[PDB]
Design a protein around this ligand. Structure first.
Ligand SMILES: Nc1ncnc2c1ncn2[C@@H]1O[C@@H]2COP(=O)(O)O[C@H]2[C@H]1O
Ligand SMILES: Nc1ncnc2c1ncn2[C@@H]1O[C@@H]2COP(=O)(O)O[C@H]2[C@H]1O
Ligand SMILES: [Mg+2]
Ligand SMILES: [Mg+2]
Lengths: 368, 374
């Protein structure tokens, strides 16, 4: 709601309590101090500008007095509205705000890790490993997923729990992601060449390299174009490249409603990773041109003990079939789990039972 | 990533371009201005404090010079790190930042508007009593009996002429005014439940009265807010009602949290409140949690129901939700039902309950009390 005010009206004085702040819609206002009954002007504010906001942010008194130079109309910003928005803001953005207030009158660790990660990337401490995906019935290796690893010389082998999230919600996903795709496709060509070299011509034609693509780099412009360049750079075919995505992409939709269709039109397979976790698929599933979905490991490890977690999984498999989507059950660590998973009708699987993620040299041996 | 610096080294001067900012790990530093080769000190910064951040935020030159008073070690904050975090921040929080920069610089030398206004307009309307509750019948699909109702919030005003009238519900739900408004909703809904049950007993429909369920929408904020279950219990006892007749409709998004929100539902369930997941299959998905949550109902959203007959794989999604629900002793309420053909398919797939225009639109208490009697 908006409020009219008379010329020369002292709206509030220096030292008052801070109920709310204002945004000027019409008119002009003067901010001033008072010292031994001398009146020193700080500035004149006009249309679009704000005042009374400092007291609300740090719960202290009015740093100055304010008087209307003419008839003005103000739009009210409440204390709760300000604190609400300041509290949700990033911890560094809050540091920045607080320090600016003081002067006008873990964050260190978070900043250092982001730079440590990026420096490691440039010192080439990251490399891709590849985990076999197998046909459950005949145990043949049908394809693989590219997984990012980091082994610093000083901190040994690093947990991906740490760096993956940090990378994904930063702009460094673009240069890193480009490197991931390029490396994964380079090694696909090498995999197919080795397969043809040992006269496994049909296995070579059906081989699928799964690459994880995050939201940021998907929604980023010129993605499909740069992807196509990298594909042609290694003389590869679209039917051997499968893009693993989180459900969350369809929250957006400026380019992200038909970007998938543009990917699908070129022959790239699209797969929904960690289905049944995070943003919900069931409606997103009727929209999206999906060829696969992956049943997360959290489901698979409760199949034998929890009998209604089994029911959830059975239902996902049957639903998937009903829309010509195929299933990859991941996290498989015991033969008994595979048995149930095949009886329920899941075609593919991946997990420790078959193979952990390994480097390209161990993987090339595995396929033979 | 961390950098050592010599005593008396001018790290940067006033008027330079701003490549990066620094955080002091060791030592002390002096910020100063220069005027006709007079050096006026602004302050001394020490361990843990920051400098060089202003130039990065608004792309302008260094407002001052900086010199190390002793041997110091600095941790670098890049421009990209700062802009990255500032850009994602709320539009008002960005306004606040930019205005503070302008005033500090001058000091030592000498849609967001619309979102904010609508929030206050909504709250003023609430206090001027422009809101009221309507009630939409939920029916048993097979025998068409009214089994219960959902309380729906209305705003009787031309200004609420959004016509896509969800909007204000969303504005309320993601604001702190959900607490005083929500309290009013719950109180009003429970008051009218007592009136519904009294009429039902008055016409010797004793069994229908015992099975009647009033569905109330409860948002995340007020659910996660402390002292919720206690205040709910007070309002229930205020109207002499039983927990088995009160059903709480919740969005899936609550299980993102879990400090209080894994067992808050169990604390509600322990008291006998039915819990229902509204708009299931939209927004967040608590599937790995849905084996855990004490859920008695879920509602198939209208967006699914209106595509059942045209889109044959939207039908498959709905069939699958119903079968899954049954497999964990959860019952289904299909909403948005506007044609008899939809109800047919919905009953064949096995959904027990329904609500929609086919049966009845939302109406005031009054038209609802008449509706029961048929
Ligand atoms: N140096 C300044 N330049 C411009 N505006 C100021 C200055 N100091 C204070 N203000 C504004 O005047 C207000 C006085 O009360 P607050 O501290 O609540 O919020 C203050 C600012 O919005
Ligand atoms: N009044 C002040 N009090 C304390 N520090 C300041 C003040 N003015 C500027 N600074 C710091 O000195 C730095 C000079 O360059 P920047 O403008 O990039 O960033 C500035 C702030 O970090
Ligand atoms: Mg993956
Ligand atoms: Mg509802």
């Amino acid at each position: 709601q908006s409020v009219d005010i008379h010329k020369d009206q002292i709206i509030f004085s220096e030292g008052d309590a801070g109920d709310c702040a204002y945004i000027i819609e019409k008119g002009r206002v003067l901010i001033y101090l008072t010292k031994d009954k001398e009146e020193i002007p700080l500035t004149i504010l006009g249309e679009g500008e704000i005042f009374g906001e400092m007291a609300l942010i740090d719960n202290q008194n009015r740093s100055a007095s304010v008087r209307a130079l003419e008839d003005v109309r103000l739009a009210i910003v409440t204390k709760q509205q300000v604190l609400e928005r300041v509290s949700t803001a990033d911890k560094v953005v809050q540091l920045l705000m607080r320090v600016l207030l003081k002067r006008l009158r873990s964050a260190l660790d978070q900043i250092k890790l982001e730079n440590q990660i990026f420096q490691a990337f440039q010192n080439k401490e990251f490399e891709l490993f590849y985990q076999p995906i197998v046909n459950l019935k005949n145990k043949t290796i049908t394809g693989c997923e590219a997984l990012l690893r980091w082994n610093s010389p000083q901190h040994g082998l690093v947990s991906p729990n740490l760096f993956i999230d940090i990378i994904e919600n930063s702009s460094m996903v673009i240069p890193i992601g480009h490197w991931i795709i390029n490396q994964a496709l380079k090694d696909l060509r090498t995999i197919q060449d080795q397969l043809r070299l040992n006269k496994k011509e049909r296995m070579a034609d059906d081989f699928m390299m799964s690459i994880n693509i995050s939201g940021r780099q998907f929604t980023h412009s010129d993605f499909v174009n740069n992807l196509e360049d990298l594909r042609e750079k290694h003389d590869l075919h679209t039917q051997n490249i499968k893009l693993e995505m989180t459900e969350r992409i369809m929250m957006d939709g400026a380019i992200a409603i038909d970007a998938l269709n543009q990917c699908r039109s070129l022959g790239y397979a699209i797969s929904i990773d960690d289905f049944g976790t995070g943003f919900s698929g069931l409606q997103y599933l009727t929209q999206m041109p999906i060829s696969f979905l992956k049943i997360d490991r959290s489901f698979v490890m409760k199949i034998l003990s929890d009998p209604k977690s089994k029911a959830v999984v059975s239902s996902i498999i049957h639903l998937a079939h009903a829309m010509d989507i195929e299933v990859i059950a991941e996290g498989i660590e015991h033969h008994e789990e595979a048995l149930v998973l095949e009886t329920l009708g899941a075609r593919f699987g991946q997990g420790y039972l078959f193979s952990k993620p390994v480097d390209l040299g161990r993987f090339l041996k595995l396929i033979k």
